Design goal:
The complex is a heterotrimer of chains A (117), B (121) and C (98). Chain A is mostly beta strands and 117 residues long. Chain A is built from no helices and twelve strands. Chain A has strands at 3-4, 11-14, 19-21, 30-34, 43-47, 58-59, 62-64, 69-72, 76-77, 90-94, 99-100, 108-110. Chain A is globular. The termini of chain A are far apart. The chains are: A mainly beta (117), B alpha+beta (121), C alpha+beta (98). Strand 11 (99-100) of chain A pairs parallel with strand 5 (87-88) of chain B. Chain C binds a DNA duplex (16 and 16 nucleotides) through helix 3. Chain A: It comes from Homo sapiens (Human). Chain A: Residues 1-117 form the Runt domain.
Chain lengths: 117, 121, 98
Amino acid sequence: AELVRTDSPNFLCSVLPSHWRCNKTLPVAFKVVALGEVPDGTVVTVMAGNDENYSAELRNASAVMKNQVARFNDLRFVGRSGRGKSFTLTITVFTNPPQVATYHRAIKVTVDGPREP
Amino acid sequence: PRVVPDQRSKFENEEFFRKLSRECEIKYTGFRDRPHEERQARFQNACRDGRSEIAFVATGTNLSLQFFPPSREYVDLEREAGKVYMILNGVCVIWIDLQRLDGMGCLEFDEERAQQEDALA
Amino acid sequence: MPGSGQIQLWQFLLELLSDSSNSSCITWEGTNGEFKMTDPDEVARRWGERKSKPNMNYDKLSRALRYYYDKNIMTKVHGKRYAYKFDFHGIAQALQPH
DNA sequence: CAGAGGATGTGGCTTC
DNA sequence: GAAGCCACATCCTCTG
């Protein structure tokens, strides 16, 4: 699969596409990479951040770190971001202490996935 | 590396951190599809356990918190009635109405851990 | 609400309950909210006539109705061959707040 | 076979 | 007026 930067350069995640439909089987499932050696078993949740509806509804939002690569069976975005607006989704790693990498302009969550208008 | 070399600099340079350095509008994000009564109990029982999910409404930034290294200075329900008082992007950093499940909060650079963590290199 | 301007099912379906001349294809079943389904595929046909959807059948119209469940518009009378009922105590929370 | 249901395109209609 | 909604359309699937 293909990766992208984060706001924490210790972790990276999937290229979640520009604009997608409210609650779809993602076109590429969500990989989250541990460069810093993480105990393969640690939990990773995500929280969709946006000035509008600050905590959107998500599904299979929790995942397990395994071989330094936490994968989400199939994450799904339900709570819509709004017009032009995307999610600065937060990414938690359950450790002592836990760590987060913010991720601005992640994905635009509308009811239609971008049809040919 | 768990943290960035210029740990102090990033906090005092990044728009992301300084936008959260001031006292901002926060709210409880846990169990959004649940009645106001259930959300009130869940949030309180979780705070007592030393964990919750609060997000800066204004900016959009969500967080899952852990009030630890039960505690005292991390989760106090006495400082005021009807309310209660990590490594973010490689930067060591550190109230909600028990009825409304909303309130105010902010980030503060952790000089202590920033040294301890920087020393592990 | 946009039930006014653009044609619904439940808004359309009940053009045919209350009207005595369309009992050829349906009827109120009793004091409580319930309704029969005379011709299962003449029903769908006219809903095609309105929607401009000639492909329409029961299977199609039906699905649309089975959505209503999770939203609390209407519900099924279990086992009865093509008989559901309207939840009005909810249509007014779905057409007005609290 | 009806009946509940995920997935995904569709078309009319408010909102920026 | 594309960009978000909306409330079916059309679909192929199970499972009683």
